[PDB]
Ligand binder design. Structure first.
Ligand SMILES: NC(=[NH2+])NCCC[C@H](N)C(=O)O
Ligand SMILES: [Mg+2]
Ligand SMILES: [Mg+2]
Ligand SMILES: [Mg+2]
Ligand SMILES: [Mg+2]
Ligand SMILES: [Mg+2]
Ligand SMILES: [Mg+2]
Ligand SMILES: [Mg+2]
Ligand SMILES: [Mg+2]
Ligand SMILES: [Mg+2]
Ligand SMILES: [Mg+2]
Ligand SMILES: [Mg+2]
Ligand SMILES: [Mg+2]
Ligand SMILES: [Mg+2]
Ligand SMILES: [Mg+2]
Ligand SMILES: [Mg+2]
Ligand SMILES: [Mg+2]
Ligand SMILES: [Mg+2]
Ligand SMILES: [Mg+2]
Ligand SMILES: [Mg+2]
Ligand SMILES: [Mg+2]
Ligand SMILES: [Mg+2]
Ligand SMILES: [Mg+2]
Ligand SMILES: [Mg+2]
Ligand SMILES: [Mg+2]
Ligand SMILES: [Mg+2]
Ligand SMILES: [Mg+2]
Ligand SMILES: [Mg+2]
Ligand SMILES: [Mg+2]
Ligand SMILES: [Mg+2]
Ligand SMILES: [Mg+2]
Ligand SMILES: [Mg+2]
Ligand SMILES: [Mg+2]
Ligand SMILES: [Mg+2]
Ligand SMILES: [Mg+2]
Ligand SMILES: [Mg+2]
Ligand SMILES: [Mg+2]
Ligand SMILES: [Mg+2]
Ligand SMILES: [Mg+2]
Ligand SMILES: [Mg+2]
Ligand SMILES: [Mg+2]
Ligand SMILES: [Mg+2]
Ligand SMILES: [Mg+2]
Ligand SMILES: [Mg+2]
Ligand SMILES: [Mg+2]
Ligand SMILES: [Mg+2]
Ligand SMILES: [Mg+2]
Ligand SMILES: [Mg+2]
Ligand SMILES: [Mg+2]
Ligand SMILES: [Mg+2]
Ligand SMILES: [Mg+2]
Ligand SMILES: [Mg+2]
Ligand SMILES: [Mg+2]
Ligand SMILES: [Mg+2]
Ligand SMILES: [Mg+2]
Ligand SMILES: [Mg+2]
Ligand SMILES: [Mg+2]
Ligand SMILES: [Mg+2]
Ligand SMILES: [Mg+2]
Ligand SMILES: [Mg+2]
Ligand SMILES: [Mg+2]
Ligand SMILES: [Mg+2]
Ligand SMILES: [Mg+2]
Ligand SMILES: [Mg+2]
Ligand SMILES: [Mg+2]
Ligand SMILES: [Mg+2]
Ligand SMILES: [Mg+2]
Ligand SMILES: [Mg+2]
Ligand SMILES: [Mg+2]
Ligand SMILES: [Mg+2]
Ligand SMILES: [Mg+2]
Ligand SMILES: [Mg+2]
Ligand SMILES: [Mg+2]
Ligand SMILES: [Mg+2]
Ligand SMILES: [Mg+2]
Ligand SMILES: [Mg+2]
Ligand SMILES: [Mg+2]
Ligand SMILES: [Mg+2]
Ligand SMILES: [Mg+2]
Ligand SMILES: [Mg+2]
Ligand SMILES: [Mg+2]
Ligand SMILES: [Mg+2]
Ligand SMILES: [Mg+2]
Ligand SMILES: [Mg+2]
Ligand SMILES: [Mg+2]
Ligand SMILES: [Mg+2]
Ligand SMILES: [Mg+2]
Ligand SMILES: [Mg+2]
Ligand SMILES: [Mg+2]
Ligand SMILES: [Mg+2]
Ligand SMILES: [Mg+2]
Ligand SMILES: [Mg+2]
Ligand SMILES: [Mg+2]
Ligand SMILES: [Mg+2]
Ligand SMILES: [Mg+2]
Ligand SMILES: [Mg+2]
Ligand SMILES: [Mg+2]
Ligand SMILES: [Mg+2]
Ligand SMILES: [Mg+2]
Ligand SMILES: [Mg+2]
Ligand SMILES: [Mg+2]
Ligand SMILES: [Mg+2]
Ligand SMILES: [Mg+2]
Ligand SMILES: [Mg+2]
Ligand SMILES: [Mg+2]
Ligand SMILES: [Mg+2]
Ligand SMILES: [Mg+2]
Ligand SMILES: [Mg+2]
Ligand SMILES: [Mg+2]
Ligand SMILES: [Mg+2]
Ligand SMILES: [Mg+2]
Ligand SMILES: [Mg+2]
Ligand SMILES: [Mg+2]
Ligand SMILES: [Mg+2]
Ligand SMILES: [Mg+2]
Ligand SMILES: [Mg+2]
Ligand SMILES: [Mg+2]
Ligand SMILES: [Mg+2]
Ligand SMILES: [Mg+2]
Ligand SMILES: [Mg+2]
Ligand SMILES: [Mg+2]
Ligand SMILES: [Mg+2]
Ligand SMILES: [Mg+2]
Ligand SMILES: [Mg+2]
Ligand SMILES: [Mg+2]
Ligand SMILES: [Mg+2]
Ligand SMILES: [Mg+2]
Ligand SMILES: [Mg+2]
Ligand SMILES: [Mg+2]
Ligand SMILES: [Mg+2]
Ligand SMILES: [Mg+2]
Ligand SMILES: [Mg+2]
Ligand SMILES: [Mg+2]
Ligand SMILES: [Mg+2]
Ligand SMILES: [Mg+2]
Ligand SMILES: [Mg+2]
Ligand SMILES: [Mg+2]
Ligand SMILES: [Mg+2]
Ligand SMILES: [Mg+2]
Ligand SMILES: [Mg+2]
Ligand SMILES: [Mg+2]
Ligand SMILES: [Mg+2]
Ligand SMILES: [Mg+2]
Ligand SMILES: [Mg+2]
Ligand SMILES: [Mg+2]
Ligand SMILES: [Mg+2]
Ligand SMILES: [Mg+2]
Ligand SMILES: [Mg+2]
Ligand SMILES: [Mg+2]
Ligand SMILES: [Mg+2]
Ligand SMILES: [Mg+2]
Ligand SMILES: [Mg+2]
Ligand SMILES: [Mg+2]
Ligand SMILES: [Mg+2]
Ligand SMILES: [Mg+2]
Ligand SMILES: [Mg+2]
Ligand SMILES: [Mg+2]
Ligand SMILES: [Mg+2]
Ligand SMILES: [Mg+2]
Ligand SMILES: [Mg+2]
Ligand SMILES: [Mg+2]
Ligand SMILES: [Mg+2]
Ligand SMILES: [Mg+2]
Ligand SMILES: [Mg+2]
Ligand SMILES: [Mg+2]
Ligand SMILES: [Mg+2]
Ligand SMILES: [Mg+2]
Ligand SMILES: [Mg+2]
Ligand SMILES: [Mg+2]
Ligand SMILES: [Mg+2]
Ligand SMILES: [Mg+2]
Ligand SMILES: [Mg+2]
Ligand SMILES: [Mg+2]
Ligand SMILES: [Mg+2]
Ligand SMILES: [Mg+2]
Ligand SMILES: [Mg+2]
Ligand SMILES: [Mg+2]
Ligand SMILES: [Mg+2]
Ligand SMILES: [Mg+2]
Ligand SMILES: [Mg+2]
Ligand SMILES: [Mg+2]
Ligand SMILES: [Mg+2]
Ligand SMILES: [Mg+2]
Ligand SMILES: [Mg+2]
Ligand SMILES: [Mg+2]
Ligand SMILES: [Mg+2]
Ligand SMILES: [Mg+2]
Ligand SMILES: [Mg+2]
Ligand SMILES: [Mg+2]
Ligand SMILES: [Mg+2]
Ligand SMILES: [Mg+2]
Ligand SMILES: [Mg+2]
Ligand SMILES: [Mg+2]
Ligand SMILES: [Mg+2]
Ligand SMILES: [Mg+2]
Ligand SMILES: [Mg+2]
Ligand SMILES: [Mg+2]
Ligand SMILES: [Mg+2]
Ligand SMILES: [Mg+2]
Ligand SMILES: [Mg+2]
Ligand SMILES: [Mg+2]
Ligand SMILES: [Mg+2]
Ligand SMILES: [Mg+2]
Ligand SMILES: [Mg+2]
Ligand SMILES: [Mg+2]
Ligand SMILES: [Mg+2]
Ligand SMILES: [Mg+2]
Ligand SMILES: [Mg+2]
Ligand SMILES: [Mg+2]
Ligand SMILES: [Mg+2]
Ligand SMILES: [Mg+2]
Ligand SMILES: [Mg+2]
Ligand SMILES: [Mg+2]
Ligand SMILES: [Mg+2]
Ligand SMILES: [Mg+2]
Ligand SMILES: [Mg+2]
Ligand SMILES: [Mg+2]
Ligand SMILES: [Mg+2]
Ligand SMILES: [Mg+2]
Ligand SMILES: [Mg+2]
Ligand SMILES: [Mg+2]
Ligand SMILES: [Mg+2]
Ligand SMILES: [Mg+2]
Ligand SMILES: [Mg+2]
Ligand SMILES: [Mg+2]
Ligand SMILES: [Mg+2]
Ligand SMILES: [Mg+2]
Ligand SMILES: [Mg+2]
Ligand SMILES: [Mg+2]
Ligand SMILES: [Mg+2]
Ligand SMILES: [Mg+2]
Ligand SMILES: [Mg+2]
Ligand SMILES: [Mg+2]
Ligand SMILES: [Mg+2]
Ligand SMILES: [Mg+2]
Ligand SMILES: [Mg+2]
Ligand SMILES: [Mg+2]
Ligand SMILES: [Mg+2]
Ligand SMILES: [Mg+2]
Ligand SMILES: [Mg+2]
Ligand SMILES: [Mg+2]
Ligand SMILES: [Mg+2]
Ligand SMILES: [Mg+2]
Ligand SMILES: [Mg+2]
Ligand SMILES: [Mg+2]
Ligand SMILES: [Mg+2]
Ligand SMILES: [Mg+2]
Ligand SMILES: [Mg+2]
Ligand SMILES: [Mg+2]
Ligand SMILES: [Mg+2]
Ligand SMILES: [Mg+2]
Ligand SMILES: [Mg+2]
Ligand SMILES: [Mg+2]
Ligand SMILES: [Mg+2]
Ligand SMILES: [Mg+2]
Ligand SMILES: [Mg+2]
Ligand SMILES: [Mg+2]
Ligand SMILES: [Mg+2]
Ligand SMILES: [Mg+2]
Ligand SMILES: [Mg+2]
Ligand SMILES: [Mg+2]
Ligand SMILES: [Mg+2]
Ligand SMILES: [Mg+2]
Ligand SMILES: [Mg+2]
Ligand SMILES: [Mg+2]
Ligand SMILES: [Mg+2]
Ligand SMILES: [Mg+2]
Ligand SMILES: [Mg+2]
Ligand SMILES: [Mg+2]
Ligand SMILES: [Zn+2]
Lengths: 49, 149, 107, 64
RNA sequence: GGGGGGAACCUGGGGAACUGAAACAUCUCAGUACCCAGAGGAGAGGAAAGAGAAAUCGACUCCCUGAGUAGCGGCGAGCGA
RNA sequence: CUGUUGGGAAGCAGCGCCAGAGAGGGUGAAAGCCCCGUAGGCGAAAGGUGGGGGGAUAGGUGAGGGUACCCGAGUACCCCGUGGUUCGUGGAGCCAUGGGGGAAUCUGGGCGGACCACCGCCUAAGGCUAAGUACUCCGGGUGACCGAUAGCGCACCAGUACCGUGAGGGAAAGGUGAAAAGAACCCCGGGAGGGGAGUGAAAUAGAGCCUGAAACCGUGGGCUUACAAGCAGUCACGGCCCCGAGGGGUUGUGGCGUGCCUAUUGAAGCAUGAGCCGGCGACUCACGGUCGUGGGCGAGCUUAAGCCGUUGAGGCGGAGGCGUAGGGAAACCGAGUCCGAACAGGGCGCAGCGGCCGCAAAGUCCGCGGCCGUGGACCCGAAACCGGGC
RNA sequence: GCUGGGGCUAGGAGUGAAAAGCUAACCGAGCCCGGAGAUAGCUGGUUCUCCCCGAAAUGACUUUAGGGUCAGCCUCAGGCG
RNA sequence: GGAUGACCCCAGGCGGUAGGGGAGCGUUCCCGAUGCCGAUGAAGGCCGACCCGCGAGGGCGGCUGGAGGUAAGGGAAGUGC
RNA sequence: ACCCGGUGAAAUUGAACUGGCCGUGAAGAUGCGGCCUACCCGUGGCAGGACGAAAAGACCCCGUGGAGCUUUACUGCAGCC
């Protein structure tokens, strides 16, 4: 959810950036690794609950 | 697991039947329509559910029965839906129309009638009507039937 | 509204690509419509001319052929290096081209 | 556009709980004087439409 | 002040037929196509002599739904709140 | 930035660097850092707009009591003819009104589907009123949209040429190259055209220009052919030529042998269609249904319009739909119900696998597929009918 | 009587010493554009490959007879055995 | 058999129009892809007596061509004359 | 008309390496069988055949196709009473 973090990483070829409200399986399956905020991990657990 | 692994199960996505695409396919030329006649034509036949070649139809030779109604239409009257004792088994304490609505048991806009199938439970059940047997069973099981007006 | 030209007649430019890459020369002409520049003694071609009043004896003449303007980089009059151009606003408060490597005016 | 219900069928026929199609027996609308009581009585019942005809009629009642 | 124009859109005044009903006339197509008048960036509608059964709602317009229900119908084909 | 191959580097190699910018288009080939841009920011003296903010102004405002003055007229209302509505004369109300008759001012009047009573609802015969809605000539953004027979009729000087008295109809036609460096000059020729020279990485890239298929025409070569009977091939063998116990080409002789498609009981058929070649050319889509099927959940399954977010991110939203009970024209009753006097008889209905667990399943949602309904619904084709114009 | 020029009458309409003649080179109903992709139970056409199975040209009814609905006969899935 | 489309062995079926079913090939476009093939030559064209495939096709090689093409695995259609 | 110089169409055309008889064949065969005849290629001529070309027979029937016309067919409408 940190905009500053997303802005810094977004232009990297190997990085896809998302706010946790936007977590979706296409973007997960597209990428080799998943990296999340504890905060993001939390809204995720709320979403799948 | 990546994109090149994402795959439907066998049978989930099947190929279409394509006709009029050659001898080898089994569906060339006439495109599975046979030779001539109305059915082979673009636009085809009259409705097969009804039409019978000009003869008076199976349907139309049967008699009408009953009240069909008339303008200005449906007469408003209170409507009942029955829910069985067995369907009440999941509840505790007090059951009411709104609760049965919410549970997906009772449809909105319907008055509630309790029916005799299944076993009664000691519950206070609030309803617009009861079958005789529903009434008997609920008393015997120690429940409290409350009748609305 | 207007074609953006980072180079003008007749600053000194490096020809950064093509057969004449590495070459340096003054910009003889700028042709915005073709997005091209003419650079002195760069991109020489042999042109056939008819025996005419303009060319008695006829034969051939040498001509500078236009260069795609992106192939060309201005040379900083200050630090003498090929550079991209920046805009700087003066007190005037006009705007000028300035070198990117140092900060000198290119005019 | 969605299928329309055939009202001619809806007025003559009913789909039972197991998907049978039931209609009134024909032949007692009139000319009854010389028909035996057995004929009148038995024609006063419903009957189950033969399967091929029932399927056709059901298709006319998509929202029953 | 008016006149005339504007791709569709809009409202009003008029308004078919093929076709469908496996013929055809009621019916359908369809108040559609089209003609005309007018409007404007929209137009129409609009502040209950409404709804219609809730002891209820609260202008009008528009979308979802109600619902292919209620009904209408050579109770046919179909039409349809 | 350098080196390197190359006509050319952006390719490859070495060493770097930017990134709130690695969308995309260019540059001699394939470039984040060369160019135009992109992310992020900045900008109007003039004219337009201004639904947002601020301010004026117009307008806005009590209580009982009595009085019964007013409260939209050829109107309501009734009848006749008709329209609108789901309502086609129907028990036919309501709303509208062409004709006739023709009121009342709240103790007045219209409505709740003939009518009457009761009970309610509402205030006709004057007018205006943003917004949410529709459209796309215009500008922009974006495509599991087209790529010159496609996509608009038009990529190009097209509503043109041309056709028609006119209304009206209505085309074809895109590409040299990186750069014109678009071939000076000489040679044959009246010119056209060509041969040299020359430019170019390339000139069968030379302007009648990218690629350059096929029909079709020609030149050269190999095999073959003037005693032979043929859907033209095929099987065999032999001859010659070619490439080097094999193969390719050709075909002398011998065997066998009734084109293709369509339509038909039946066609080589003297039945249809086709000169040949290239390109265009016909079973689709939406919504609904019905089966099957791949999953999700399961007495439950599922959301629609919207709303928030995103800017190729997803979520919220339960209104509603299907299912959970049937039977009866219905009142109604209900695991039953209807017919019946019946407690008769009959019709239509009613009841998982394993050690609480799992599993499976009603059902339902979504995807996929077959087929059906509605639309032009596989494509092409009438003769005609109608409307408005010429 | 013929003829120049200037005019009027047109689509179910004109005009016709009448032939259903003529109304812009085909008139028992002009032409153009539109409804419109009218409708066509008729004729034609319907495009890659391989594999398994494999019909009918009957019966009933049909303003039906060269078209249909149902049955029969083919095929595929599940079930029974 | 072996346990499961691993391959082998024995056996039997395999003419086919309307038509049913099954399995595949190829075309355009999307994901894969900020990748990968590509001027030491893309696509397209012309040959081939070679390789794989039952076949539709797919490789490979020579020539042409001169700037694009696009895998395994999936998705969608203006998809084969 | 014919020949030489100049310019140079057309309908038609599955492809053709396109003979006779007697047969056969969907019943009138260059194309099938048997036999007979026949060196290869033209030019001017003739029309018996190619069921020669042209025109999706205008006769005839069929289509619940169309149109013009009629009437004591049906049902309307103008117009008149
Ligand atoms: N908030 C975000 N990071 N959104 C997704 C990235 C946005 C943008 N499409 C990008 O890739 O640069
Ligand atoms: Mg990105
Ligand atoms: Mg990124
Ligand atoms: Mg990625
Ligand atoms: Mg991304
Ligand atoms: Mg699909
Ligand atoms: Mg489909
Ligand atoms: Mg299949
Ligand atoms: Mg296919
Ligand atoms: Mg095929
Ligand atoms: Mg098949
Ligand atoms: Mg078949
Ligand atoms: Mg065929
Ligand atoms: Mg057909
Ligand atoms: Mg079929
Ligand atoms: Mg089929
Ligand atoms: Mg079929
Ligand atoms: Mg057919
Ligand atoms: Mg047939
Ligand atoms: Mg047939
Ligand atoms: Mg056919
Ligand atoms: Mg037939
Ligand atoms: Mg037929
Ligand atoms: Mg048929
Ligand atoms: Mg047809
Ligand atoms: Mg059609
Ligand atoms: Mg039809
Ligand atoms: Mg009959
Ligand atoms: Mg009803
Ligand atoms: Mg009503
Ligand atoms: Mg209690
Ligand atoms: Mg500037
Ligand atoms: Mg360079
Ligand atoms: Mg250098
Ligand atoms: Mg200035
Ligand atoms: Mg009916
Ligand atoms: Mg009866
Ligand atoms: Mg009776
Ligand atoms: Mg009676
Ligand atoms: Mg008797
Ligand atoms: Mg008796
Ligand atoms: Mg009796
Ligand atoms: Mg009785
Ligand atoms: Mg329903
Ligand atoms: Mg139900
Ligand atoms: Mg005016
Ligand atoms: Mg105006
Ligand atoms: Mg109107
Ligand atoms: Mg008016
Ligand atoms: Mg009107
Ligand atoms: Mg109108
Ligand atoms: Mg009219
Ligand atoms: Mg009609
Ligand atoms: Mg029609
Ligand atoms: Mg219709
Ligand atoms: Mg119909
Ligand atoms: Mg009809
Ligand atoms: Mg019909
Ligand atoms: Mg008729
Ligand atoms: Mg009609
Ligand atoms: Mg209508
Ligand atoms: Mg319109
Ligand atoms: Mg106007
Ligand atoms: Mg607006
Ligand atoms: Mg208004
Ligand atoms: Mg008011
Ligand atoms: Mg409902
Ligand atoms: Mg209507
Ligand atoms: Mg090179
Ligand atoms: Mg070099
Ligand atoms: Mg370099
Ligand atoms: Mg590098
Ligand atoms: Mg970006
Ligand atoms: Mg880019
Ligand atoms: Mg780029
Ligand atoms: Mg690259
Ligand atoms: Mg690329
Ligand atoms: Mg770039
Ligand atoms: Mg910006
Ligand atoms: Mg900007
Ligand atoms: Mg007041
Ligand atoms: Mg007062
Ligand atoms: Mg008074
Ligand atoms: Mg009033
Ligand atoms: Mg007045
Ligand atoms: Mg009236
Ligand atoms: Mg009406
Ligand atoms: Mg009425
Ligand atoms: Mg009625
Ligand atoms: Mg009414
Ligand atoms: Mg009343
Ligand atoms: Mg009235
Ligand atoms: Mg009146
Ligand atoms: Mg009152
Ligand atoms: Mg009163
Ligand atoms: Mg009234
Ligand atoms: Mg009234
Ligand atoms: Mg009312
Ligand atoms: Mg009432
Ligand atoms: Mg009253
Ligand atoms: Mg009211
Ligand atoms: Mg108004
Ligand atoms: Mg407002
Ligand atoms: Mg407005
Ligand atoms: Mg508005
Ligand atoms: Mg809009
Ligand atoms: Mg636009
Ligand atoms: Mg394309
Ligand atoms: Mg493209
Ligand atoms: Mg073209
Ligand atoms: Mg075009
Ligand atoms: Mg082309
Ligand atoms: Mg076009
Ligand atoms: Mg245009
Ligand atoms: Mg065109
Ligand atoms: Mg064009
Ligand atoms: Mg032109
Ligand atoms: Mg003309
Ligand atoms: Mg002209
Ligand atoms: Mg025309
Ligand atoms: Mg070029
Ligand atoms: Mg060029
Ligand atoms: Mg180049
Ligand atoms: Mg000369
Ligand atoms: Mg000379
Ligand atoms: Mg010359
Ligand atoms: Mg020469
Ligand atoms: Mg020359
Ligand atoms: Mg040279
Ligand atoms: Mg080279
Ligand atoms: Mg080359
Ligand atoms: Mg070449
Ligand atoms: Mg070339
Ligand atoms: Mg090029
Ligand atoms: Mg060329
Ligand atoms: Mg050429
Ligand atoms: Mg030769
Ligand atoms: Mg001899
Ligand atoms: Mg010889
Ligand atoms: Mg032979
Ligand atoms: Mg032999
Ligand atoms: Mg050999
Ligand atoms: Mg051979
Ligand atoms: Mg040989
Ligand atoms: Mg032998
Ligand atoms: Mg033969
Ligand atoms: Mg034969
Ligand atoms: Mg063939
Ligand atoms: Mg044919
Ligand atoms: Mg035939
Ligand atoms: Mg025949
Ligand atoms: Mg025959
Ligand atoms: Mg023959
Ligand atoms: Mg022949
Ligand atoms: Mg014939
Ligand atoms: Mg023939
Ligand atoms: Mg025929
Ligand atoms: Mg031809
Ligand atoms: Mg040919
Ligand atoms: Mg072709
Ligand atoms: Mg289909
Ligand atoms: Mg479609
Ligand atoms: Mg569909
Ligand atoms: Mg389906
Ligand atoms: Mg499904
Ligand atoms: Mg689920
Ligand atoms: Mg849910
Ligand atoms: Mg519903
Ligand atoms: Mg019922
Ligand atoms: Mg009774
Ligand atoms: Mg019973
Ligand atoms: Mg029973
Ligand atoms: Mg489950
Ligand atoms: Mg399921
Ligand atoms: Mg079906
Ligand atoms: Mg349609
Ligand atoms: Mg159509
Ligand atoms: Mg269609
Ligand atoms: Mg269809
Ligand atoms: Mg005509
Ligand atoms: Mg008519
Ligand atoms: Mg008529
Ligand atoms: Mg008429
Ligand atoms: Mg007219
Ligand atoms: Mg005179
Ligand atoms: Mg005169
Ligand atoms: Mg005159
Ligand atoms: Mg005159
Ligand atoms: Mg006239
Ligand atoms: Mg006159
Ligand atoms: Mg006129
Ligand atoms: Mg006419
Ligand atoms: Mg007319
Ligand atoms: Mg007429
Ligand atoms: Mg007349
Ligand atoms: Mg005369
Ligand atoms: Mg004319
Ligand atoms: Mg004439
Ligand atoms: Mg006529
Ligand atoms: Mg004429
Ligand atoms: Mg028009
Ligand atoms: Mg129409
Ligand atoms: Mg047509
Ligand atoms: Mg017709
Ligand atoms: Mg087809
Ligand atoms: Mg078999
Ligand atoms: Mg039969
Ligand atoms: Mg029958
Ligand atoms: Mg019969
Ligand atoms: Mg007949
Ligand atoms: Mg007969
Ligand atoms: Mg027929
Ligand atoms: Mg059948
Ligand atoms: Mg059998
Ligand atoms: Mg079966
Ligand atoms: Mg089976
Ligand atoms: Mg077989
Ligand atoms: Mg199978
Ligand atoms: Mg494929
Ligand atoms: Mg293909
Ligand atoms: Mg695309
Ligand atoms: Mg990509
Ligand atoms: Mg790429
Ligand atoms: Mg590479
Ligand atoms: Mg090469
Ligand atoms: Mg391509
Ligand atoms: Mg190949
Ligand atoms: Mg190649
Ligand atoms: Mg490129
Ligand atoms: Mg390819
Ligand atoms: Mg690809
Ligand atoms: Mg793949
Ligand atoms: Mg995928
Ligand atoms: Mg197509
Ligand atoms: Mg001579
Ligand atoms: Mg001559
Ligand atoms: Mg031949
Ligand atoms: Mg011969
Ligand atoms: Mg004989
Ligand atoms: Mg013959
Ligand atoms: Mg013979
Ligand atoms: Mg012969
Ligand atoms: Mg032969
Ligand atoms: Mg033979
Ligand atoms: Mg023979
Ligand atoms: Mg012979
Ligand atoms: Mg012989
Ligand atoms: Mg002889
Ligand atoms: Mg001769
Ligand atoms: Mg002759
Ligand atoms: Mg002659
Ligand atoms: Mg012959
Ligand atoms: Mg002859
Ligand atoms: Mg003859
Ligand atoms: Mg002929
Ligand atoms: Mg003729
Ligand atoms: Mg004819
Ligand atoms: Mg024809
Ligand atoms: Mg004929
Ligand atoms: Mg005929
Ligand atoms: Mg005649
Ligand atoms: Mg006749
Ligand atoms: Mg006949
Ligand atoms: Mg006839
Ligand atoms: Mg008839
Ligand atoms: Mg018939
Ligand atoms: Mg008729
Ligand atoms: Mg007629
Ligand atoms: Mg007529
Ligand atoms: Zn400097």
């Amino acid at each position: 959810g940190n905009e500053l973090v997303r802005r810094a990483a977004r232009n990297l070829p190997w990085v896809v950036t998302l706010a946790p409200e936007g977590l979706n399986v296409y973007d997960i399956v597209r990428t080799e690794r998943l990296v999340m905020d504890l905060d993001a991990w939390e809204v995720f657990q709320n979403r799948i609950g | 697991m990546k994109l090149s692994d994402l795959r439907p199960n066998p049978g989930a996505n099947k190929r279409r039947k394509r006709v009029g695409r050659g001898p080898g396919s089994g569906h060339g030329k006439t495109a599975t329509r046979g030779h001539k006649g109305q059915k082979s034509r673009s636009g085809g036949l009259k409705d097969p559910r009804r039409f019978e070649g000009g003869r008076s139809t199976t349907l139309m030779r049967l008699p009408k029965r009953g009240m069909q109604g008339q303008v200005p239409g449906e007469i408003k009257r209170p409507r009942y839906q029955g829910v069985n004792l067995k369907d009440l088994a999941r509840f505790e304490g007090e059951v009411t129309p709104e609760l049965l609505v919410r549970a997906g048991l009772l449809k909105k806009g319907y008055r509630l009638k309790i029916l005799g199938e299944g076993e009664a439970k000691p519950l206070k059940v609030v309803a617009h009507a009861f079958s005789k047997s529903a009434l008997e069973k609920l008393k015997a099981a120690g429940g409290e039937p409350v009748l609305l007006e | 509204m207007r074609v953006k030209m980072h180079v003008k007649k007749g600053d000194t430019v490096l020809v950064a690509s093509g057969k004449y890459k590495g070459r340096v020369g003054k910009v003889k002409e700028v042709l915005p419509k073709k997005y091209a520049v003419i650079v002195e003694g760069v991109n020489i071609v042999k042109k056939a001319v008819r025996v005419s009043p303009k060319y008695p004896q006829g034969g051939f003449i040498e001509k500078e052929a236009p260069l795609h303007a992106s192939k060309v980089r201005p040379i900083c009059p200050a630090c003498g290096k090929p550079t991209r151009v920046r805009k700087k606003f003066l007190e005037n408060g006009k705007k000028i081209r300035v070198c990117a490597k140092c900060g000198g005016a290119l005019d | 556009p969605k299928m329309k219900t055939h009202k001619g069928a809806k007025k003559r026929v009913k789909i039972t709980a197991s998907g049978k199609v039931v209609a009134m027996k024909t032949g007692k609308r009139h000319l009854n004087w010389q028909k035996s009581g057995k004929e009148i009585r038995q024609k006063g019942r419903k009957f189950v439409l033969a399967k091929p005809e029932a399927e056709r009629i059901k298709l006319l009642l998509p929202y029953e």
